[PDB]
């Protein structure tokens, strides 16, 4: 998850990240980061319950 966040940051820095329609670059970067972190937290939680 950290590697994915880092590479998303890289894509945003190299202007390689296309803004989501209906959102600006800042909020779409925020959305990607939040999605990655929430997916990581959900997967770790599910592994815990398993």
């Amino acid at each position: 998850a950290k590697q994915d966040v880092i590479e998303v940051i890289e894509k945003a820095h190299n202007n390689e990240l296309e803004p989501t329609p209906g959102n600006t670059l800042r909020q779409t970067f925020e959305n990607q980061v939040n999605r990655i972190l929430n997916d990581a937290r959900d997967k770790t939680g599910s592994s815990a319950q398993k």
Binding site: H13, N14, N15, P19, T24, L25, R26, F29
Partner: protein, 117 residues
């Protein structure tokens, strides 16, 4: 396009204002205090950039390189002097519509080079 810049009266050092010399049909800048006139060389009075496509490199200054709190990378070298280490950061500017783009400043002082990638 360019930007129009205010320049001042040589007599009383005040702001010129645009005027039309109706007889010659030529633009004249007139001080409302004194009778001084001068012919304008730009022919433009007012410019307003609504899209505000701004080159932040002009507002970036060289001494930002010695900031201890800025990140440092050797992956991107400087172009004139080829210095290995470079300091990079984001816009740090309000009303940056959509910009996560990094602005780089070269260390090894007296270089002060600034670029964008």
């Amino acid at each position: 396009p360019g930007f129009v810049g205010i320049r001042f009266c040589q007599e009383c050092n005040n702001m010129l204002y645009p005027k039309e010399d109706k007889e010659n049909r030529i633009l004249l800048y007139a001080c409302r205090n004194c009778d001084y006139q001068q012919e304008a060389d730009n022919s433009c009075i007012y410019v307003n950039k609504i899209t505000h496509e701004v080159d932040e490199l002009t507002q970036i200054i060289a001494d930002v390189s010695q900031d201890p709190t800025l990140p440092r990378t050797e992956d991107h070298p400087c172009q004139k002097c080829g210095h290995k280490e470079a300091v990079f950061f984001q816009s740090h500017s309000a009303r940056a519509e959509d910009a996560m783009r990094l602005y780089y400043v070269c260390t090894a002082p007296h270089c002060g080079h600034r670029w964008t990638e």
